[PDB]
Amino acid sequence: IVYPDPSTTLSQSLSVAQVLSKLTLPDAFINMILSGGDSVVMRTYQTEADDDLDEGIRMTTYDQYLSHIRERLHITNVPDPIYITGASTPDQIAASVQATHVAVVLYQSGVINGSASTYLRENEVLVVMPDYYDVVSRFANANLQMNNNRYHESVLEIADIFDQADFIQTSDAVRQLRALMPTLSTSQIRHAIERIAQ
Amino acid sequence: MLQQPTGGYTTLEQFAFTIRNDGTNATPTQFLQLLSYEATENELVKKTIPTPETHLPSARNVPGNVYIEDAITQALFGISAQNVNAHGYFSRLSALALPNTSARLGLDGVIYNSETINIPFYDPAAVANFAATYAKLGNASTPRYRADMIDIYAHVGLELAGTDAERAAGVMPVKRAKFDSWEGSLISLSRDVVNWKILAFLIDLCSLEGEALRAFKTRNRDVFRMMLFIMSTAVAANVVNRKVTKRVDRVLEYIGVNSMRTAGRTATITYDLSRHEFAAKFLQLTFTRWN
Amino acid sequence: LAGANTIIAIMRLFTPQGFLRTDDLAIAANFPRASRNPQTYIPYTNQRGTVTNEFASRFRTIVATLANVVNERAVQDDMQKATRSCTKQWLRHLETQFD
Amino acid sequence: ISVARSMRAIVNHNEVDRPRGAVAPSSYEMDTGTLSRNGDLLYSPVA
Amino acid sequence: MYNDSRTLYMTQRHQELLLAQITADPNILLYPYTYIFTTIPTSMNYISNTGQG
Amino acid sequence: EAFRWSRYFLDELRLRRLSVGLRLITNPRIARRFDGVRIMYLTDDDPDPD
């Protein structure tokens, strides 16, 4: 009976395995310097006697939340954020954010008290609203800057809220690096993982 | 040829355990104040600790000299990936356990066969008791000897995060400990606590008597609660860092409950299967001596 | 709707995009408008972030919810089970071409 | 401008000591620190 | 117990039956990780039958 | 175990070299590009450094 030599089949494996690693090597690197964070267009409502360009009462739509925040909140296994609803305690937001790791709370129905409304200013917990027709029907207030007749609207980041030591590259030295490039598309980044090949 | 006045080598400035953080260098006591914790409702109760087995392994004949000290730390708090270490020259210790031996244990962390010229070493009489307890760490991976890598950890969490109001009853609520951080954090304390001269501590535990043991345990219950914290993040299930406005917190999942694989991966220090048996053999051996 | 939320759902995938603007560069130069007020649609804004593009992500959501309608239609006789699987190789390929 | 400037004007003046704007080498470009077991490059004790 | 699900939850007097037999014979293997709880507690009674009629 | 995180598909040792390299790329002496230039006329000369 003939018994085949182990060396000739063992050599084939370490060859097909070595080719695979250096194949996708440049592809995964650019997807690391990027992937830091992006998008999520939110507006911050400047409350008070206009002594701020950024107050802290920010909110986004339930629509924007369903395509950016929801998918990532399932990669990291967490209980979903509690609903503010109305007449909720100014520590229920705190009790949620504890086990959520990210500042976020869902919707508003019956106008909340001016005890929980203050809380949202410093902690930056953003409230996702299903509607956007009007917003100051759902807050009880001392009446300053509230009247919907403006709010400085800008953009947020996945780089700030949602930090994970892995999967979201969070180094501010590279955050400084990332804030220089001339706004990449899908074709600009494609030719980037192409010139790095040859 | 240093000697101890019963103050012990820890009552000395020759070697002192200091963490570096905050832009300057600080003592362990100052650090721990930052560790604030809450409760998550899974009762972590103190079990009993089974006594070790007297049989000492044999230091198989070895020419040259190994850095016995190196490995003790290079396994516990070793940061850089450490491969299998269940094997090794890890029991040359027992060659100091017998009465009249010439083999001496220097400073820095070596074990000489014959005392050589120009090398300062611990006192030959008080290094004997240290061996009749720690040379027993040689058989750490021998089947039917290894400790249990689950229950000791309950003992560990009641130490660095247990308010006395709790330990006096033997039961406490599982905690989730978060302090404020900087950049590398958890990995930086490891690269730091590694070079500490651990032998300068352990020798004192087995010698210093009730007079200077009650006083020793009071000034050093913190150098212990430091090399016990790092050794703990090598176990915890998660390391996710919460975000304030500009501040960053290093929430640690479940200190005091032992899982099987590191939360760090990349963020913190990591253990291995061969090391899980080792940490249980150390943690078990040391607690009886301490407590 | 009363008892067919199942239809009043996909019956929202036709929603208008972008914003409506009051054109001023025509009314400021006094061009004759048959409407009392000059208005128009855009009809889909432009890029706002660095690498987001919400218009491409809106279409991605349509493809996601429109896939379930195809991946639920209980058919019989097998030939539709053949095309019921090989339609996602068109349903997903097309969404990648869109981005 | 001029951030990468270790030192300058390596000539001694006609009659006076230091020739105006003259920079001496940094006290760190000249320090060999021993390596730790895990750690790799650290400076001298200084005290 | 949902989040834990690794220790068997004996109920005081349930635990003692092992303690009464472990001393009756040394050298016998048991599941090491154990939790003892006294809080059950008590409540309402209910009623039912699975017969005919 | 391996299917928990991706590590950006990079190697374990090669991910640690990135940490040391991310210090070189941000050092005060390597950044040699400058922004902003004020135009003014004062014709009077010493060469100086800056």
mmCIF file of C-alpha atoms in Angstrom, chain B residues 2 9 14 35 38-39 41 94 101 110 121 137 152 163 181-182 200 206 212-213 256 272:
data_model
loop_
_atom_site.group_PDB
_atom_site.id
_atom_site.type_symbol
_atom_site.label_atom_id
_atom_site.label_comp_id
_atom_site.label_asym_id
_atom_site.label_seq_id
_atom_site.Cartn_x
_atom_site.Cartn_y
_atom_site.Cartn_z
ATOM 1 C CA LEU B 2 20.142 44.381 51.929
ATOM 2 C CA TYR B 9 11.821 46.086 51.702
ATOM 3 C CA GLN B 14 14.841 51.777 46.481
ATOM 4 C CA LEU B 35 -13.087 54.522 39.990
ATOM 5 C CA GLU B 38 -23.064 51.395 40.462
ATOM 6 C CA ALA B 39 -25.023 48.112 40.569
ATOM 7 C CA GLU B 41 -28.335 43.069 40.249
ATOM 8 C CA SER B 94 12.034 25.446 44.944
ATOM 9 C CA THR B 101 21.524 26.080 49.677
ATOM 10 C CA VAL B 110 17.283 36.938 38.826
ATOM 11 C CA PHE B 121 20.566 40.256 46.777
ATOM 12 C CA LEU B 137 3.434 27.780 41.659
ATOM 13 C CA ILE B 152 -11.510 33.022 42.986
ATOM 14 C CA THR B 163 -17.028 49.011 50.182
ATOM 15 C CA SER B 181 -9.537 58.232 30.945
ATOM 16 C CA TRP B 182 -7.119 59.597 28.342
ATOM 17 C CA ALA B 200 10.031 43.332 46.584
ATOM 18 C CA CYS B 206 5.633 35.649 54.244
ATOM 19 C CA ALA B 212 4.647 44.740 61.362
ATOM 20 C CA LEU B 213 2.016 42.783 59.404
ATOM 21 C CA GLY B 256 -15.541 40.474 39.753
ATOM 22 C CA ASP B 272 -4.826 33.048 26.909
#
